[PDB]
Design an enzyme around this catalytic site. Structure first.
Site, PDB file in Angstrom:
ATOM      1  N   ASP A 197       2.939  14.256  36.522  1.00 19.93           N
ATOM      2  CA  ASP A 197       3.057  14.515  37.965  1.00 19.93           C
ATOM      3  C   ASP A 197       1.757  15.006  38.586  1.00 19.93           C
ATOM      4  O   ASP A 197       1.718  16.046  39.235  1.00 19.93           O
ATOM      5  CB  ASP A 197       4.187  15.510  38.263  1.00 19.93           C
ATOM      6  CG  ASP A 197       4.664  15.433  39.710  1.00 19.93           C
ATOM      7  OD1 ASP A 197       5.134  14.354  40.138  1.00 19.93           O
ATOM      8  OD2 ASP A 197       4.567  16.451  40.424  1.00 19.93           O
ATOM      9  N   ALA A 297      11.682  18.626  39.277  1.00 18.12           N
ATOM     10  CA  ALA A 297      10.710  19.151  40.218  1.00 18.12           C
ATOM     11  C   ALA A 297       9.383  19.238  39.468  1.00 18.12           C
ATOM     12  O   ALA A 297       9.352  19.258  38.230  1.00 18.12           O
ATOM     13  CB  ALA A 297      11.122  20.536  40.687  1.00 18.12           C
ATOM     14  N   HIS A 298       8.297  19.308  40.230  1.00 17.62           N
ATOM     15  CA  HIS A 298       6.945  19.396  39.684  1.00 17.62           C
ATOM     16  C   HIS A 298       6.803  20.345  38.494  1.00 17.62           C
ATOM     17  O   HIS A 298       6.343  19.950  37.432  1.00 17.62           O
ATOM     18  CB  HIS A 298       5.980  19.838  40.787  1.00 17.62           C
ATOM     19  CG  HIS A 298       4.558  19.947  40.337  1.00 17.62           C
ATOM     20  ND1 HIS A 298       3.778  18.844  40.058  1.00 17.62           N
ATOM     21  CD2 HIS A 298       3.775  21.029  40.115  1.00 17.62           C
ATOM     22  CE1 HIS A 298       2.575  19.245  39.685  1.00 17.62           C
ATOM     23  NE2 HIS A 298       2.548  20.567  39.711  1.00 17.62           N
ATOM     24  N   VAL A 299       7.188  21.602  38.682  1.00 14.85           N
ATOM     25  CA  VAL A 299       7.079  22.603  37.627  1.00 14.85           C
ATOM     26  C   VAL A 299       7.745  22.217  36.310  1.00 14.85           C
ATOM     27  O   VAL A 299       7.230  22.529  35.238  1.00 14.85           O
ATOM     28  CB  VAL A 299       7.666  23.955  38.090  1.00 14.85           C
ATOM     29  CG1 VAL A 299       6.756  24.582  39.136  1.00 14.85           C
ATOM     30  CG2 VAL A 299       9.050  23.740  38.677  1.00 14.85           C
ATOM     31  N   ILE A 301       8.115  19.205  35.040  1.00 16.14           N
ATOM     32  CA  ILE A 301       7.681  17.936  34.458  1.00 16.14           C
ATOM     33  C   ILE A 301       7.285  18.079  32.984  1.00 16.14           C
ATOM     34  O   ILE A 301       7.366  17.109  32.218  1.00 16.14           O
ATOM     35  CB  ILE A 301       6.495  17.322  35.265  1.00 16.14           C
ATOM     36  CG1 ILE A 301       6.338  15.839  34.923  1.00 16.14           C
ATOM     37  CG2 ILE A 301       5.201  18.084  34.969  1.00 16.14           C
ATOM     38  CD1 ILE A 301       7.488  14.970  35.394  1.00 16.14           C
TER      39      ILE A 301
END
Length: 320
Positions: A197, A297-299, A301
């Protein structure tokens, strides 16, 4: 195969493992391949520390994921193991074949890449690239280009000739992509460029320590770590906070370079921006892009959960 825990240190280590993972039977049991992770390691370190009356660090577990190896660390002169897990090179796993170099996120640590241990075939070495303090490149670099150049030199020392296999998470993705571009300019082959990401800084810079949530989750693990009662050491989180500040600083100086190769991008669907697709964002800087969307979510990934799908895809991509 192998042996069974030996009397003393190894036995004490195996008992610790059992208590946490829920089962050690032999000295060659790998903490991470079985399900462990850095937080569960912070518990181990603090546990053994209070148990053997010696400074045992989570970093020591990260680089000595074996009962045998960790026992040796505790048995050796504690003056030579103080920085283990906190150095530029982080040997998560040593193999007798190719090496997958993994680049650190804004924290400067590559401990999160331990999640790859359960997926990559045995022959693979999993080597993390970190930015320690003081003197790690994130702290001394005037711009991000300086950090890419420093890591490139580190990479070339670890493996002088290609082909290269690179993996980056967030800021690490930016570094990995910049390093890939530089390797290509050197006529070297980049067989794998994995991006977890990662987005071109340009699609974010057009907009200080922010988000505060980025300091919140950092504070989240802050408590999680201290949950096993930090024992006189705070070097881990002061290093993380210091690097975060520098990451913010450096990202403002960040400019992407064209990589004439193929990249494998894992996208966190839940945090995608309406209007800016991954294909559109990377078009000017990556020639070919294979995208795998993840429901996170991003965190998350790089979370073990997300990796139940990412891990096999990476293994499949690397095998060839």
């Amino acid at each position: 195969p192998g042996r069974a825990p030996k009397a003393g240190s190894e036995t004490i280590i195996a008992a610790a493992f059992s208590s946490l993972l829920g089962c050690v039977q032999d000295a060659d049991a790998d903490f991470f391949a079985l399900g462990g992770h850095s937080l569960l390691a912070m518990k181990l370190a603090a546990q053994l520390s209070r148990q053997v009356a010696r400074q045992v660090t989570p970093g020591q577990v990260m680089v000595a994921s074996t009962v045998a190896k960790l026992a040796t660390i505790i048995d050796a002169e504690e003056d030579s193991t103080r920085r283990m897990g906190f150095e530029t090179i982080l040997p998560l796993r040593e193999g007798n074949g190719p090496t997958l170099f993994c680049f650190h996120p804004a924290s400067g640590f590559a401990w999160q890449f331990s999640v790859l241990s359960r997926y990559l075939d045995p022959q693979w070495s999993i080597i993390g690239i970190q930015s320690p303090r003081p003197n790690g490149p994130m702290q001394t670099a005037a711009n991000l280009d300086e950090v890419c150049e420093a890591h490139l030199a580190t990479l070339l020392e670890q493996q002088p000739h290609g082909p290269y296999y690179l993996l980056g998470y967030s800021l690490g993705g930016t570094l990995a992509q910049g390093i890939a571009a530089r390797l290509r300019a050197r006529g070297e082959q980049v067989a794998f460029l994995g991006l977890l990401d990662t987005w071109p800084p340009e699609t974010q810079n057009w907009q200080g320590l922010d988000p505060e949530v980025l300091a919140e989750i950092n504070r989240e693990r802050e408590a999680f770590l201290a949950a096993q009662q930090g024992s006189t050491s705070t070097e881990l989180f002061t290093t993380i906070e210091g690097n975060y500040a520098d990451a913010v600083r450096l990202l403002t100086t960040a400019h992407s370079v064209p990589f004439d190769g193929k990249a494998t991008l894992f996208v966190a669907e839940r945090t995608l921006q309406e209007g800016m697709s991954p294909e559109r964002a990377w078009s000017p800087w990556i020639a070919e892009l294979d995208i795998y969307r993840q429901d996170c979510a991003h965190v998350d990934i790089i979370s073990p959960g997300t990796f139940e799908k990412i891990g096999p895809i990476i293994r499949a991509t690397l095998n060839r």
